[PDB]
Symmetry: D2
Subunit: 498 residues, 4 copies
């Protein structure tokens, strides 16, 4: 029997585990330490969650090590590993409303969006990677023969072993799922650190691994701080790979910690300041819809959000006019209400950062067309914001807001290379977009954009089969697609002479 926080909400009964998950059981942290998790809709405490300590990290890693080296997970067929992951996806689907409701409470995710994305994409991710298990293949290689003898060379794709996953708060279940699904499909075991502010779907997911029959110790979950729990994971001599998602500055630190301990493998999914270039020959009404989505999707708490819009001179004023018209139509409110399409920011400190961000934009001389403030209601709601007359040297032209702030610059009619130069003038390189009906412009621009993803006449169109990762200081390694598996596999070369 597991202890739950129980809550009647959204036409169901939530049963939320709140403890650490280690070796297939929910357990208190050392000293029974706890912290409060906060509902961004009203600022209330949802419940108390165990606060993992260093000794809890060591217990989690030891359980993962034992599960990998001696448990059933390391013994079963890849096909049967696949079956278990497909079953886990099924169990997640059976609990989809509950999961999406927890995400609405914990992260401020609009419930209808959470059902399709936060939860829906997580389910797709597990099903996708479950199909990879028995299709992960090595090679046989035609090497030079040591005549008069013969040689056979093959490669074997093997698991890396114990992995650590450290993730942010914007899509709590989805960020966990991207990495966890690829990690488990490759045959590894894992210790996961959700962002401290958003532990609840991670702990519910943990319970679901029990319902699915995932062997004890394969999945371990440690609500807690990066500076304590995350650090220890990065430092641990039995951890062999870290999958990290978060800010560029913490990514640098994580990579350093991997180096100094045991040169554990690392992937880094970091910040972005993604440019969206909108040409005059696009479909304008569609550009407004997609451009708004590129910024405002999930209250802007979206790594790939367009952090800069470049709009061709001749359509700029009309584009801005239409955006403002549509922004006024947005329904801001409780993420559980069906008419809501703009939920609260994830937590109070982030709301404060956004308010300060827009003050700097005003101070430095950008035109605040609308928004810029907290919405005067309970919780941590921020107004959908539009800036114009943004110049390349401005702070808001350079810094990632990670909020619902559309930051608009002009470019001269007929310019192409000039705007590309401006769009590429960043140490980030996560995503980018271009709206145009012109085939030649679209292909040329996608060639020249210095970013890991280029959207053409769309935005936010991610897919579990399509690899996702950045260039430059947005990091390296992929989530999603076949490419993601490579972060969680090692290649052993075997060479015979006969």
């Amino acid at each position: 029997v597991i202890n739950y926080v129980e809550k009647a909400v959204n036409k169901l009964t939530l049963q939320m585990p709140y403890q650490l998950f280690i070796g297939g059981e929910f357990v208190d942290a050392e000293g029974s330490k706890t912290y409060n998790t906060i509902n961004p809709t009203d600022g209330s405490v949802i419940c108390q969650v165990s606060l993992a300590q260093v000794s809890d990290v060591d217990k989690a890693v030891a359980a993962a090590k034992e599960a990998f080296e001696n448990g059933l997970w390391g013994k079963i067929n890849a096909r049967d590993r696949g079956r278990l992951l497909y079953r886990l996806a099924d169990v997640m689907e059976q609990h989809q409303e509950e999961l999406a409701t927890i995400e609405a409470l914990d992260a401020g995710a609009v419930y209808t969006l959470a059902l399709k994305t936060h939860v829906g994409m997580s389910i797709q991710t597990f099903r996708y990677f479950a199909g990879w298990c028995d299709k992960i293949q090595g090679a046989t290689i035609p090497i030079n023969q040591a005549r008069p003898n013969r040689n056979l060379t093959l490669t074997k794709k093997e698991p890396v072993g114990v992995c650590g996953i450290v993730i942010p708060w914007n899509y709590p279940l989805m960020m966990l799922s991207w990495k966890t699904a690829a990690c488990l499909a490759a045959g590894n075991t894992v210790v996961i650190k959700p962002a401290q502010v958003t532990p609840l779907t991670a702990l519910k997911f943990a319970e679901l691994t029990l319902k699915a029959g995932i062997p004890k110790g394969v999945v371990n979950i440690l609500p807690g701080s990066g500076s304590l729990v995350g650090q220890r994971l990065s430092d641990h001599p039995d951890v062999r790979k870290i999958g990290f998602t978060g800010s560029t500055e913490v990514g640098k630190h994580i990579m350093k910690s991997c180096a100094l301990s045991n040169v554990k493998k690392v992937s880094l999914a970091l910040g972005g300041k993604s440019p969206l270039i909108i040409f005059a020959d696009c479909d304008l009404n569609k550009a407004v819809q997609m451009g708004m989505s590129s910024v405002f999707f999930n209250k802007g708490e979206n790594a790939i959000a367009a952090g800069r819009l470049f709009v061709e001179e001749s359509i700029h004023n009309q584009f801005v006019q239409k955006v403002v018209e549509e922004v006024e139509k947005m329904k801001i409110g409780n993420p559980l209400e069906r008419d809501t399409n703009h939920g609260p920011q994830n937590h109070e400190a982030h709301l404060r950062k956004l308010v300060e961000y827009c003050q700097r934009g005003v101070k430095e001389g950008a035109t605040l067309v609308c928004g810029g403030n907290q919405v005067p209601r309970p919780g941590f709601f921020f107004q959908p914001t539009v800036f114009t007359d943004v110049e390349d040297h401005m702070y808001i032209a350079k810094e990632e807001s990670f909020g619902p702030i559309m930051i608009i610059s002009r470019f001269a009619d007929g310019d192409v290379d000039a705007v590309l130069s401006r769009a590429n003038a960043t140490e980030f390189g996560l995503a980018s977009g271009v709206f145009t009906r012109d085939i030649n412009k679209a292909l040329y621009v996608s060639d020249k954009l210095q970013a890991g993803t280029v959207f053409i006449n769309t935005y936010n169109k991610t897919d579990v089969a399509a690899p996702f990762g950045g260039f430059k200081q947005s990091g390296f390694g992929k989530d999603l697609g076949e490419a993601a598996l490579n972060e969680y596999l090692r290649i052993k070369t075997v060479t015979f002479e006969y």
Copy 2:
């Protein structure tokens, strides 16, 4: 007109550049600083070589950046890039006797071996990777469709950009070639730091890039110290990838430096303590020949060298007797003499370490069967060495010698899992081997060995098509084969809606 150090040796007239190679020209370092490169056969100075300074690194990176962004290398077809690399291999082959002679002088490489391996494999490396240029392919991916609209998702494989390569001294030209060929095949430009003690084949290679018509700035070479030149390469804001080969401890520092600057990508080819397990049912005479090769090849200056031999009890004494017999037949001498089997160690500091290594092995109680000493002759020669009665707790059971020291332990008749545990009880995981006629043992042992390469009834059988890289603290990433290309490529995902 290039300045050479001219030398008449080995029935050739060597013409050796000695300056920095920056932007397609040989130039002096800042302040015309130089250092001496030492011939390990007699301890004499070969010549003075330019000593790169920080401002020289900045010039080399600037030249590489220009070559990539604006030069011809970034504009030509993949097919034509391949043609240039195949021409480069042809030029290397035209100069093969000269290159092997330089390697004999600089590194102490036995000339006949340098023709086949140090230089021979370097030529094969460029030809192999030349073939990859127009065969590097992205993907088209069947993503979910945004109905009633359609989506197309593709990936493009692109160059990473400016790379730094930092290498050691054991196979100076070949270590350079592995990384350089894959790096250039993928369309990058490069700044190479050879090991300070072995700059000469790198500088001759530089001149050969001119003969082959590699555009200026594509290849740049900076003899100098790791703590100065290598450090700056790892720190540089315009460098996007470091390919590193060296010790585990420097690898840790390199990775930290990549992290702290601009999270540049990194590959780490580090140290080894590779186990070779020899069962009683092997071919004994072959096991002796291959066992000796596993240790003594290239005077033991071989990262994959077997650093422990485990020999089954019933054949142990006969194995040792036969090795001693064969060791006594080895001809130690000038690497340029055709009858030489065993050349000098690479440099004096390394010889000193090997002497100390064997002193400690005797101190801690291992049986010194033969060798262990500097050979009484000029230069830095070390006697092929055999230790027996080695126990798992001993320093020589744990520490990488990187010299010609065969380190032998017994295991009990029939004790497969037990010997495997002993073989795996190391934080290294570079290579390994097993000698047995039994198919079931061979396959089971190769599954269980925790190493990036497993040799079965052979050793030292590397091939330009077979990926090479370690596990655990032997690093990550691959040199050679198709896999090596992934270190020098980035994947861009392009998603259309239409």
Copy 3:
């Protein structure tokens, strides 16, 4: 309401459809023509089954064409096609006992075996290929650029369209499933012709596609003759691909019919005379168990069955003695008896062929050690048979029996090339095997055997992930694994200039 033949048997009430399945409906054939399907355990008529006519073939192809061109199957996401195929596998699993019982009745498959293989592997097949749907990918290719313009070249993997599948009677559901799963996973629609003698699991399968929600017309099944139904399929102008499994001689005719009509694509999975080479250094008792299995599995009605055993001279007589001892322990009887090891042959005409085959073997001078005749009891049971003193010129050394007849020749110790020559002296090339503890022999022999599959120290180890197909007159193309998809996909190259 679907009409069923109802039967109380094996603790179940079987509900067996018996009509043609066209466009999602069970329908009588033209003129309500029918034929009898026979139970091989007692020779009784199970029921009457609709007998497809030419107009019925045209209706099925029209339904398949409409389903492909305009129906839902052609419009849904690859991922969603995958979901439907997974659901089909789940439905088959929910009905596995019923399917295995039907296969016992219709094909004489031993019930316990049919659960694991005839049905269990069919289920694995659908689940395996379900996972491929959203992982079928094309390429982007670095072609030469038409300067000063640019080029993008990509490939798209597309379905071939309407396919015809024609199969034999030995594993009715499994042969169906292998091809159908790959065919549908690739996005095609299909008309299936089961062997006339074994229509029943195919028709139950058809009903399961309805339960699974496979869109109407995607799957169509036409019990009937090869010379009428199969012929029309191969001739039909709207069929673009035939997947054929059967005899070499019918395969020749089928390929010709494809040629003469519309050059439709064809795969050919044909006969075998597979050699198993057993060396004196094998584990003898294991060689006996696996050698017996290589021949007697599924009453010899197994295309990959070892059709000759070459047994090394020094172990031959002991091998034969052990085989005879084990053959005598085999329980022959009703496929529903849970201790049955050997069921009846599939149908009466095959039994008669096997009696004649053995008369011919004795006549030409082979030694009949045991078996060779019909078991005196109702139905069509044939004794497990062993021949020795078989020589290379003999009819039974050349001709495929497709029955439980072990055909043994000696070979001399210390020649390997000589036994290979004898093993390779056939126009078949489907499978082969080698039993030896010697790694060098195993690897060399596997290199030299001229067969699409080589088993080493095992036999009949097929797997849904491992491609299966023959060489020479055993045909071409693969069932199973990733390679099977290529028979059901076409590649479109798309080249842009911009």
Copy 4:
């Protein structure tokens, strides 16, 4: 010493072999039979060429078989096979002017074009496939384990063995090179049948294999008739694969012959009636240039030639006007004159077909705008032809001309699906094209076109890396790219239990 036909022409002294090439030597055919090859510029006899007989085919196949089974080609490293093919390309490059001159004489190929395409692309083809030799790789596959035992499954890519190549006359050297390069790269040996009318570059190529060091019997060349030599190749019991390029009707017969003998593998590169759709929103001047090229390139003797142009109503009249203007500027003349841009048709029988084709076009009611006739001069020149008012029911809307005949229909402004339906209403499916600046339209049309290749805003943009093959009655299998190798390889699955 080889017998040559010597010819002083194009400022060169041509040395043309004229005999059969069998087992590394030029020999007369059985009975010294010969036939005349005809210069299409003036209708004169170039020289007498040996006429291969059945016994000569048997000798070639025996030589290919011995070279494969016992000769050096079957023994050398894949890497060394690649070196030989690169060397072959180099020799071809050293002879490029001579080869292009021979092609001008034999096939009427315009010299400047033959240099770039006929010969230039043949060279690229051998270099490209030379690079594949040591990069052809099999797999290791994660199959279900027969617990308590373990299984390893791998695939080996092997050569198919002796191949027959049967080709047409439009690009004699290039068609040979496409197939021969892939065939040899995969490790096979080959007997080549050039079109009887164009044997000369094939025989010169044969001599170049000698210069390049290709082992005797690896390449064998038999000038002669399809009905005799081609037939025997398709019939031969030792040939295991036919690579065929030619008409759809001969393709059907070839496939039938493959079936009836030994089910040898076959690829079919057959005819085309490829549609080019030109929208009003294209760049009109570029559409005219590329539209011209799509029809007139290599005097229309181009399998992928656009056989229908569909031009949008609003630009149709202007397109036709501009085409007529450009057609009038074409210089018809001797292929060796530098100002010629339209050479003679390949041979007399083809010229006659083209005359009849245009007669039937006029008869059935199409508007003949220009050409349609043999040019009044010696040889077999044909006037570049333009037809308009072509309706879907007409012969020239359905039948492949394989000549310089532009066949134009209108489609209504704003129609897309309607014109696609018309473009797809053919049993051919080789190539196609679309000209439009609209990204949505270009992507949609490329999805919907039922053809193996789709060109977007270009035409005739083939590449050695880009796979090329048809759908429907245009055949199956690819030439060029990685995909081409699959036709010349077989996959062996090796499964161990241990």
